[PDB]
Amino acid sequence: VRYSLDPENPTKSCKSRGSNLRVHFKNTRETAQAIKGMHIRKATKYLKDVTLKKQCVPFRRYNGGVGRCAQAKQWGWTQGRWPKKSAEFLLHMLKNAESNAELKGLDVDSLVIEHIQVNKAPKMRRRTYRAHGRINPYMSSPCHIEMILTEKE
RNA sequence: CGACUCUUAGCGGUGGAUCACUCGGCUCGUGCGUCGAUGAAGAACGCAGCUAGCUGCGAGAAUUAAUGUGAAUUGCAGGUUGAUCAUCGACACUUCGAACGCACUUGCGGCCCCGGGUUCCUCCCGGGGCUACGCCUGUCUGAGCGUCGCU
Numbered sequence: 001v002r003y004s005l006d007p008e009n010p011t012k013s014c015k016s017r018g019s020n021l022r023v024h025f026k027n028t029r030e031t032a033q034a035i036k037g038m039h040i041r042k043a044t045k046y047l048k049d050v051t052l053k054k055q056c057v058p059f060r061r062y063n064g065g066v067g068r069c070a071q072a073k074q075w076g077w078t079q080g081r082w083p084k085k086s087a088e089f090l091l092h093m094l095k096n097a098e099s100n101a102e103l104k105g106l107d108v109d110s111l112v113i114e115h116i117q118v119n120k121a122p123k124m125r126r127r128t129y130r131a132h133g134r135i136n137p138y139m140s141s142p143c144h145i146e147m148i149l150t151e152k153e
Numbered sequence: 154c155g156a157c158u159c160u161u162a163g164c165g166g167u168g169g170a171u172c173a174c175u176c177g178g179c180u181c182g183u184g185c186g187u188c189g190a191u192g193a194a195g196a197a198c199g200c201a202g203c204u205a206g207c208u209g210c211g212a213g214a215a216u217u218a219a220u221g222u223g224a225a226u227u228g229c230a231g232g233u234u235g236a237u238c239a240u241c242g243a244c245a246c247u248u249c250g251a252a253c254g255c256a257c258u259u260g261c262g263g264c265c266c267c268g269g270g271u272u273c274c275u276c277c278c279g280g281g282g283c284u285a286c287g288c289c290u291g292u293c294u295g296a297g298c299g300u301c302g303c304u
């Protein structure tokens with residue numbers, strides 16, 4: 001599958017991919033920007049802390065009306081949330097990348113998430129009912145998620 | 154440095170433009186110029202080993218016979234003295250519908266002939282053929298203090 005970014009060392013790099021994932025794209029982008037510079041153990045621990053509301057995802061671009069928490073000050077930001085479903089989906093995908101690395105025989109504890117990006121999947125359609133006999137869209141915003149690990153010691 | 158924002162490029166998404174195709178339309182021209190009470194057009198309901206739609210067909214129901222052709226149909230199974238296709242002149246063609254026994258509930262009949270029932274004794278059941286309107290010619294039966302003739 002044609003990836004967006006090629007790895008600098010494909011022997012020591014593994015890939016994972018997911019398409020048409022029923023997650024909010026904006027929450028997925030902000031948490032992937034949080035994951036993007038991390039080692040795999042730190043990323044797994046921080047994604048568990050997001051679901052347990054111990055560490056937050058800073059909302060940097062899509063932050064309109066997003067409330068302010070105390071835990072965002074570790075990121076140099078004021079607005080943060082804890083997207084649970086979005087943290088679990090790219091934890092399942094991170095486990096898939098773990099399983100793909102173990103298949104290639106790469107070292108488990110040296111994996112650093114080198115590339116990750118979130119794209120917009122095709123939007124799927126439902127319908128809501130408004131006043132004065134008007135019917136409005138109830139569109140979902142699913143996402144494609146892409147990541148590449150790299151042995152970085 | 155970092156976040157955020159702007160511009161450009163690479164790659165990836167969203168979207169289906171452009172191009173190239175076309176068993177489709179539009180227009181012109183030619184030949185023929187054919188429906189129906191022997192039941193038309195239209196509609197309804199059914200019919201396939203696995204079948205919803207489209208198509209084809211009518212209880213003989215994706216067809217029967219005959220003729221031409223000549224080894225297939227096919228998504229999967231099953232089984233040359235002619236498989237399949239095409240032609241189509243034979244046979245068949247459920248219900249409503251001008252729609253025809255009366256009505257349109259799928260209801261109520263009447264007449265005749267058969268088979269069970271019975272042993273012609275009417276019942277009951279099943280089957281078949283008739284039972285609409287208008288109108289032409291002829292037949293039969295009639296009507297009139299209509300016009301007459303005769304006993």
Ligand SMILES: [Mg+2]
Nearest residue numbers: 060061062063
């Ligand atoms: Mg903003």
Ligand SMILES: [Mg+2]
Nearest residue numbers: 063064065066
């Ligand atoms: Mg506001």
Ligand SMILES: [Mg+2]
Nearest residue numbers: 128129130131
């Ligand atoms: Mg409402």
Ligand SMILES: [Mg+2]
Nearest residue numbers: 131132133134
């Ligand atoms: Mg209303």
Ligand SMILES: [Mg+2]
Nearest residue numbers: 161162163164
């Ligand atoms: Mg770009």
Ligand SMILES: [Mg+2]
Nearest residue numbers: 199200201204
């Ligand atoms: Mg059928």
Ligand SMILES: [Mg+2]
Nearest residue numbers: 216217218219
């Ligand atoms: Mg035949």
Ligand SMILES: [Mg+2]
Nearest residue numbers: 220221222235
């Ligand atoms: Mg033949």
Ligand SMILES: [Mg+2]
Nearest residue numbers: 256257258260
């Ligand atoms: Mg009634």
